[PDB]
Amino acid sequence: SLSTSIPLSSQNSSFLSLKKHNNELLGIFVPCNLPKTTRKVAIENFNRPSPDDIIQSAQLNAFNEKLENLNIKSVPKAE
Amino acid sequence: MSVQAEIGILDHVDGSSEFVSQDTKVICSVTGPIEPKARQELPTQLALEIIVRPAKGVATTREKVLEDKLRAVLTPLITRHCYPRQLCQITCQILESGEDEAEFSLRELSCCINAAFLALVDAGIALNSMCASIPIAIIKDTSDIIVDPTAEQLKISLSVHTLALEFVNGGKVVKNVLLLDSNGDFNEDQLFSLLELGEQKCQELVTNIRRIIQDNISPRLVV
Amino acid sequence: MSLSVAEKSYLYDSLASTPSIRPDGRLPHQFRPIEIFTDFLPSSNGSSRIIASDGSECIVSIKSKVVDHHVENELLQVDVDIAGQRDDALVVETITSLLNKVLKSGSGVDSSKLQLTKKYSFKIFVDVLVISSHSHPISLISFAIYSALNSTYLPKLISAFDDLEVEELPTFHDYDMVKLDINPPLVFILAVVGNNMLLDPAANESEVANNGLIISWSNGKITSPIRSVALNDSNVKSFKPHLLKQGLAMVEKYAPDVVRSLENL
Amino acid sequence: NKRWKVDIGGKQHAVLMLGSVNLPGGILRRKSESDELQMRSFLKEGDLLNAEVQSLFQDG
Amino acid sequence: LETIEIHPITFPPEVLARISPELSLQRHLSLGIRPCLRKYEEFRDVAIENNTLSRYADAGNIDTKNNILGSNVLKSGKTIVITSITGGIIEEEDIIANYASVYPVVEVERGRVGACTDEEMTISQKLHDSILHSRILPKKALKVKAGVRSANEDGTFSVLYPDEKRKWSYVLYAKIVVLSRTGPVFDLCWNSLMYALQSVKLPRAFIDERASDLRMTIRTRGRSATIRETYEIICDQTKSVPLMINAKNIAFASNYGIVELDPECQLNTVLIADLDTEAEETSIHSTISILAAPSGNYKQLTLMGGGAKITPEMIKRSLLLSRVRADDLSTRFNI
Amino acid sequence: QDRRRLLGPAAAKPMAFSSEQELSLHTGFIENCNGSALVEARSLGHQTSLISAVYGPRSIRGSFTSQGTISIQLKNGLLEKYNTNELKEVSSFLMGIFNSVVNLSRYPKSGIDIFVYLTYDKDLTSQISSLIPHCITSITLALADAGIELVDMAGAGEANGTVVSFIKNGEEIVGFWKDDGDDEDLLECLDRCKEQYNRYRDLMISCLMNQ
Amino acid sequence: MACNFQFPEIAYPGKLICPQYGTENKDGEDIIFNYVPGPGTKLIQYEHNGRTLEAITATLVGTVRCEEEKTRRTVKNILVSVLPNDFANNLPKEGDIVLTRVTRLSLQRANVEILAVEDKAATFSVSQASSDLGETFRGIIRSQDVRSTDRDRVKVIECFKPGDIVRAQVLSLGDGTNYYLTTARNDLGVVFARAANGAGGLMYATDWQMMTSPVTGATEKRKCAKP
Amino acid sequence: MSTFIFPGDSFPVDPTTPVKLGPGIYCDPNTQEIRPVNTGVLHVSAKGKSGVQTAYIDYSSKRYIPSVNDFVIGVIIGTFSDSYKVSLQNFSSSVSLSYMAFPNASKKNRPTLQVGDLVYARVCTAEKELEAEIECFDSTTGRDAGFGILEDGMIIDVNLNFARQLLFNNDFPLLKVLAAHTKFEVAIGLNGKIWVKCEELSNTLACYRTIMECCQKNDTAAFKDIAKRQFKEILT
């Protein structure tokens, strides 16, 4: 109850709230330099490697061959 | 005269030089590779800590702006990967400016750059290329370029320009431009004129410094 | 810290219980033995050496100039300087502030015992050297300033200056001095360890205390500056309104006796 | 990493080291390697402790 | 070999740059974009608010705890530059020594407790230097005269104006502080300076009858020369005439980079306009700084060819970009 | 002049001269800093904007320290002029509050660098007393945004040049300042400032709720 | 988040999460609950209602997640932890990984500047420290932790040089002068290096102890990072 | 081939023809071409006299960088448990010396040395990435070669080019001149330091003064006159 939930009247003459949302280049308080979606294409380029690499972090044959070399050596330690 | 250079003059330091350009006179020392301070240890790189100290009064903020200008030029001149985790302190003392220090830095700077090259040659620290730098002004009276200007000619400048270029494959093919600091008003047709002239006037200066180091080194190293 | 972990808990327990016994073993209203030595500079207006029981020593010295006061809004300048600290460490300058505000004109201290005609004020240069510190100095400095400012002798005016006497600088009698009467505040430090409020911490107490409250006594009453302070970094806690009201009540009672014993040597 | 430096009020500090220290948790236990940490857990800076002089050296 | 793997997992851009800015920069470059994930020839947008900090922000309030002559707040990216221009008073063509300079302090905050660091001092002096060689402020302009302030016995006071013994000139400072520097800041400092300078007004200044015979009796405990004349000159800001300035010599800055892309080093010569991230500041060693003015006059170009190839072709494109950016800023804030 | 900075002509001298408030909060608006806050307060009297930035937890290795510490720089405004000593006092004051509110035990070898920028204060009509609510509002927000532990949000009022800071819903006091207020204000001020603290408490909580 | 019948979904500084002791009957039978704080929480003391109260109070702005370390039923220990740049919310400590770069190589050790801390991955952060934003701190990788298949005769020059970028897990806090690293695991070692002993082409791991230079044509031996 | 080279110039043999590298030739770490970087005289060897040619530049320095199989005089500037720390020539990087670096020394056969003893040693390990190590015991020869700990004498600082030129040419006439004028003991370091000692004070000093004088002028005819004048001076 202490907090309660009132909105806030701005009344901002400094203009900080627009700066907070820099956003794309088609945003508010940004110049234009690309008429396409700037962020999203970059994000997509992020998106194509990530599920592929994180899962396949030990599924390739180089890693599998290397795991066996570690595992064989590893064994006399455990026993 | 025009220019004169000597090396080896100082004896207690790893390498040294005396560069005189008419009125302007800079004596230089390179010390190192020597033991790094911990704040100036860099991992794969040689560190540079450059000091420019004026003749009149005591070094201020101005000489840091000059240090940056010098440091820019010197970082690809000295083979950084030649010594990892060592420091080199280059200490450039100006014995006469013979001009006005705050106002013009054109001759001062060009001279330091050349005395730094020579000192480093004497020092034995690896140098990829030859560097010299020449001072270029434009005077308002004719409204035109005068190369390698005197103290008087500097007063009547509207604008002033130093260039430094990296010299390979016979020290005569311009590899790159390591500096071009053009202060005062210029428009483009002058500026490409300042490169053009600049090229040929640098390459002469390179010839003269090249010649000097051979003659002074040759009675030392004998077989 | 410089004490033990074991030592700090014993103290915390000791102090925090009903009796509040401590290495001196004082009830909360009592003060350690202090020694006032005065007037040792013939060159100064007044001077003060105070040696306290922890072996803390402040030397406080009073110098002056008479100045036109209509080009000034300050009459008392404190310079604090603590041996073994430099002239700009955080604590030193914070002490300078506190003290300058305690001694601020028209606020718990006179700005009409320092004027000899209504155009000319004496600018009193308080200059404070702490010879050894290892406990807080401000209370001891406050006490030293009291004895000082009642030992402050000023030049006696040659003749009753007006502000239209001839409109030239005031000029002093050659030998004859005026005694300076003036009642500065006395800063008193209170310490809170649990719900227990105790007058005058020792060094040891300061190192376990949650917080203290600096308050000052001027003119038969309590007055601003009031400030809380935290007298460690690492045994710190919060406190209640009721404990702050009990510390008011405590000073009001126990302050007057102290000012009257300190006044006459 | 190998010794505590002890303040006895002398001209320099006295040394107290690992072959010379009983330890809580046994009589010498709860500590299997030298580390500056393991030393530090038992004895913090400023802690007070009664210790006997084993040999006086000519250093001080 | 030939099967592949042993490349580490994907690190975010920031973490990637901390790990290797050489690496992170080149990777960004292949998609044709800057590390700030924007195309090469776009920049950072510039937003200014002016007279939100200056003394002379209002007409009905002149308050004596304020003295800020001209002022600007400028925000680009996240990097925010706050400029305040402040006077003082010192009693005293095409020649460099008839143009005057601002004597700035530029303070930068990067998490350093100090404020006397080698990065900020070099900025401040270079900044004094740029202002000299760009020729903005002719010394006639700070060369002011004084009227008379005469108090009457009629219970009024008359402060008498000349048309605006001894002489005086003013000096100009700028207290510029910087919060959360993420790239080259120099051009930000210069952009804001101009909007401020074109907002500078100067106080009026006055002297008493027989100023040349007013006494100084301030020095004491000499030894002669402890009684003399002096001039004493208050300033009154009840009127302030506005700065007389050379508009043609106003510049607005930009910043450039020259860098190379190699396809086997993220396992020719490429031009970037402006630098915004850590990765760009770190590893774009060949860079050109231009101050271009918006008539095809240039008041400084400084090329630092920190190692990589520069053909002048890149230089020739940058001098045009910089004037067109200069023309954009100009019209954008009508100043 | 000086060797570390340009100070121009040195014989040159300055120019001689001739709930009642709304706090609106902002955070997370500039980057090179672990968290930032912005507090602008408008009142009849004066309008003010205070920026804060908090840097670190930083490691301070080569020494082991019992626990962390907090270091406060106040920086003189660009339109407000104060003595360096007062800034020290207020720095010292705020440190002792923050010592009590920030929990320090999750972080060995820690130093935290807090910067208080007292940028703009402007009167339309001491002074340093009045901006203490605003400093405390700003810095707390910043410690919260960064992910620095806190006992309760810290926050204060100013009633009659007297500043009282509380935590725990007005229940506990973490600091007290009185400077040039009137004798026996105690009840009025504590009542009046509790109102103020409960009111700005929730504002800070709601700033932290947009993120 | 819900974890029982008394938890807040959203929490903030100074906000109660849950009482220090709880109770609920599951299957007709009370299960006393005993709550303790972990990271992002503190147990803070109180007086309310004329009695001591002790309570679990969130310190950090976030989601209130339950995890474990584990009347006529058992007591069950529920740790309380409110998880929310973020170098202000982690310092190098045990079980956090750091990204480090070798600022000096030495006989039985390597000083490695810490440039980043990894979140406790998929959630990553970068340190606010930089050599361009000023201040440095370092920790040490030793000769003993380089590998762990053989490791008492494999020197660090045989596997490291200056300027190489290495991912390492902080093993302990250790001494106050350093942080003790381990590169021993098969997901820690050199992230990348530059051929020609830190001067050539950018090279990546093509075996766990070889990095193939794309500009010299040769293998530059290291200890290497893996996924 | 024995010709003056500058930095920023082409190589005067082809890079296509196999060569072993020696001092002062750098290989670009991107380009993978070899180029000179020092100002001096370049020498290239010719096959049929070598197996593969070795190329190198003679360049003057006054600052010494560790290379292996070099012989160096150092001063012991630190006492540590397992090793000692040497400075060969002043202001520079640590050079380390094992406890067991001396002939017939082991861990039950530990030395006792101190700061301020002079050593004479071979560089037996050199890196830039790690520290250089000296042993006073020659592992290649298998006899230390009179390597060990010097005492007495007086260290003359020299030029690097002078020091290598006296060591690697035994037609250099300085020590031929000196051997007529006294009997002496000589130790030649390649770190820009050269030690000398006679039996008597006069005799040592004349050597110290003469090599120094000779070294400055650094001229071949100068060397004769300088000895004869100086060795008279000390007995006048």
Structural tokens at position B121? 């040659």
Strand bridging mode G97-106 / G165-172: antiparallel
In whole angstroms, what is the distance from residue F15 CA to residue E204 CA? 10
Q: Are C198 and C28 in contact (CB under 8 A)?
A: yes
Question: Which 8-state DSSP code applies to residue G15?
Answer: -
Question: Can you give H208-234 as a three-state secondary structure string?
Answer: HHHHHHHHHHCCCCHHHHHHHHHHHHC
The distance from CA E243 to its chain's CA centroid, rounded to whole angstroms, is 17
Q: Which chains touch C (3 or more CB pairs under 8 A)?
A: D, F
Amino acid type, A20: K
Partnered with residue G112 across adjacent β-strands are G102, G139
Q: Are G124 and A50 in contact (CB under 8 A)?
A: no
In whole angstroms, what is the distance from residue G89 CA to residue H150 CA? 59
Question: Can you give chain E as a three-state secondary structure string?
Answer: CCCCCCCCCCCCHHHHHHHCHHHHHHHHHCCCECCCCCECCCCCCEEEEECCCCHHHCCCCCCCCCCCCEEEEEEECCEEEEEEEEEEEECCCCCHHHECCECCEECCECCCCCCCCHHHHHHHHHHHHHHHHHCCCEHHHCCCCCEEEEECCCCCEEEECCCCCCCCEEEEEEEEEEECCCCCCHHHHHHHHHHHHCCCEEEEEEECCCCCCEEECCCCCCCCCCCEEECCCCEEEEEEEECCCCHHHCCEEEEEEEEECCCCCCCCEEEEECCCCHHHHHHCCEEEEEEEECCCEEEEEEEEECCCCCCHHHHHHHHHHHHHHHHHHHHHCCC
In whole angstroms, what is the distance from residue C135 CA to residue C201 CA? 9
Task: Note whether B178 contacts E305, CB cutoff 8 Å.
Answer: yes
Strand bridging mode E169-179 / E105-106: parallel
**Residues of chain G contacting H, Cβ within 8 Å:** 105-107, 157, 161-162, 195-197, 199-201, 215-216
Strand bridging mode H54-58 / H20-21: parallel
Determine what percent of chain F falls in helix, strand and coil, rounding each to the nearest 5. Answer: 30, 30, 40
Identity of the residue in B84, B166, B223 whose CB atom sits nearest the CB atom of H129: B84
Amino acid type, E153: E
In whole angstroms, what is the distance from residue F24 CA to residue F41 CA? 7
Cα dihedral H216→H219→H225→H231 (10° resolution): 40
Please report, in angstroms and rounded to a whole number, the separation of the first and last CA atoms in chain A.
Answer: 61
Structural tokens at position D11? 């001209």
Question: Which helix (H) or strand (E) segment is A67 a member of?
Answer: helix A61-78
Three-state secondary structure call for residue F145: helix
Other beta carbons less than 10 A from residue E161's beta carbon: 11
Does A16 lie at the interface with F, CB-CB under 8 angstroms?
A: yes
Closest chain A residue to the Cα of G150, Cα to Cα: A73
Q: Are D23 and D42 in contact (CB under 8 A)?
A: yes
CB pairs under 8 A between C and D: 13
List CB contacts of C109: < 8 A, sequence separation 6 or more.
C76, C102, C103, C182, C183, C184, C185, C218
Three-state secondary structure call for residue G104: strand
In whole angstroms, what is the distance from residue C103 CA to residue C225 CA? 10
Determine what percent of chain C falls in helix, strand and coil, rounding each to the nearest 5. Answer: 25, 35, 45
In whole angstroms, what is the distance from residue H26 CA to residue G196 CA? 12
Structural tokens at position C230? 């935290």
Closest CA to B30 of B108, B110, B126: B126
- D7, D40, D42, D44: best to mutate for the C interface, most C CBs within 10 A: D44
Three-state secondary structure call for residue F202: helix
Does G12 lie at the interface with F, CB-CB under 8 angstroms?
A: yes
Strand bridging mode G30-37 / G76-83: parallel
Experimental technique for the deposited model: cryo-EM
In whole angstroms, what is the distance from residue B178 CA to residue E286 CA? 8
Q: Are C224 and C108 in contact (CB under 8 A)?
A: yes
In order, the DSSP letters of B63-89 are HHHHHHHHHHHHHHHB-GGGSSS-EEE
Q: Are E121 and B64 in contact (CB under 8 A)?
A: yes
Asked, as a colleague might, if the bond just before B89 is cis with ω within 30 of 0, I would say: no
In whole angstroms, what is the distance from residue F81 CA to residue F87 CA? 11
The distance from CA H71 to its chain's CA centroid, rounded to whole angstroms, is 6
Residues of E in contact with B140 (CB under 8 A): 94
Q: Are G155 and G143 in contact (CB under 8 A)?
A: yes
The distance from CA B43 to its chain's CA centroid, rounded to whole angstroms, is 27
Identity of the residue in F57, F61, F65 whose CB atom sits nearest the CB atom of G87: F57
In whole angstroms, what is the distance from residue B110 CA to residue B77 CA? 15
In whole angstroms, what is the distance from residue E75 CA to residue E72 CA? 10
In whole angstroms, what is the distance from residue C241 CA to residue G50 CA? 17
Rounded to whole angstroms, the maximal C-alpha distance in chain D is 35
Q: Are F25 and A6 in contact (CB under 8 A)?
A: no
| Buried/exposed code over H66-89 (b: 16+ C-beta within 10 A; e: otherwise) | beeebbbbbbbeeeeeebbbbbbb
CATH of E8-334, one of 3.30.230.70, 1.10.10.60, 3.40.720.10, 3.40.50.970: 3.30.230.70
Question: Which 8-state DSSP code applies to residue A5?
Answer: -
Three-state secondary structure call for residue D4: strand
Three-state secondary structure call for residue G193: strand
Question: Which helix (H) or strand (E) segment is G196 a member of?
Answer: helix G195-198
**Which residues in chain G are immediately followed by a break of C to N over 2.5 Å?**
70, 84, 120
Partnered with residue G101 across adjacent β-strands are G113, G165
Amino acid type, A2: L
In whole angstroms, what is the distance from residue E306 CA to residue E293 CA? 26
Report residue B181: phi and psi, to 5°.
Answer: -115, 110
Q: Are H72 and H129 in contact (CB under 8 A)?
A: no
Determine what percent of chain D falls in helix, strand and coil, rounding each to the nearest 5. Answer: 15, 15, 70
Other beta carbons less than 10 A from residue B79's beta carbon: 16
Amino acid type, B190: Q
Q: Are G99 and G36 in contact (CB under 8 A)?
A: no
CB pairs under 8 A between E and G: 82
Three-state secondary structure call for residue G93: coil
Residues of A in contact with E6 (CB under 8 A): 62-63, 66
Q: Edge-to-edge, what's the strand order for the sheet holding G21-25? A: G10-11, G62-68, G76-83, G30-37, G21-25
Residues of H in contact with B210 (CB under 8 A): 6
List of long-range contacts for G30-33, beta carbons under 8 Å, 24+ apart: G30/G71, G30/G72, G30/G73, G31/G71, G31/G73, G31/G74, G31/G75, G31/G76, G32/G71, G32/G73, G32/G75, G33/G4, G33/G75, G33/G76, G33/G78
Closest CA to E18 of G128, G137, G95: G128
Question: Which 8-state DSSP code applies to residue F17?
Answer: P
List CB contacts of D59: < 8 A, sequence separation 6 or more.
D12
Does F29 lie at the interface with D, CB-CB under 8 angstroms?
A: no
Residues of B in contact with F7 (CB under 8 A): none
Other beta carbons less than 10 A from residue C33's beta carbon: 8
Q: Are C228 and F183 in contact (CB under 8 A)?
A: no
Other beta carbons less than 10 A from residue H197's beta carbon: 18
Q: Are B117 and B131 in contact (CB under 8 A)?
A: yes
Distances from the Cα of F153 to the Cα of C89, F131, F144, F203, G80, angstroms = 29, 18, 9, 11, 20
Min distance B39 CA to chain G CA atoms (Å) = 9
The reported resolution of this PDB entry, expressed in Å, is: 4.2
Three-state secondary structure call for residue C226: strand
In order, the DSSP letters of A12-37 are -SS-HHHHH---SSSSSS---S-SS-
Residue count of chain C? 265
Strand bridging mode C115-117 / C153-157: unpaired
Structural tokens at position H221? 């005819």
Residue B49 exposed, middle or buried by CB count within 10 Å (0-12, 13-18, 19+) = middle
Residue count of chain G? 227
List alpha helices for chain C, DSSP H. Answer: 5-16, 90-102, 138-149, 203-206, 241-263
In whole angstroms, what is the distance from residue E65 CA to residue F126 CA? 14
Question: Which 8-state DSSP code applies to residue F46?
Answer: E
Closest CA to E40 of E208, E270, E266: E270
Report residue F91: phi and psi, to 5°.
Answer: -55, -45
CB pairs under 8 A between B and G: 23
Angle of the F84-101 helix axis to the C90-102 helix axis, nearest 10: 110
Closest CA to G180 of G190, G189, G168, G192: G168
Per domain, the residue ranges of chain E are 8-334
List CB contacts of A33: < 8 A, sequence separation 6 or more.
A25, E38, E39, E41, E42, E43
Residues of F numbered 63-92 whose beta carbons fall under 8 angstroms of chain D's beta carbons: which are they? 64, 66
Structural tokens at position G168? 């390492």
Task: Note whether E180 contacts F33, CB cutoff 8 Å.
Answer: yes
Question: Can you give H83-126 as a three-state secondary structure string?
Answer: EEEEECCCCCCCEEEECCCCCCCCCCCCCCCCCCCEEEEEEEEC
For tokens 């626990």, name the residue.
F67
Structural tokens at position H144? 């230390």
- Helix (H), strand (E) counts: chain C: 5, 12
HSE-up of residue H123 (Cα within 13 Å, Cβ side)? 23
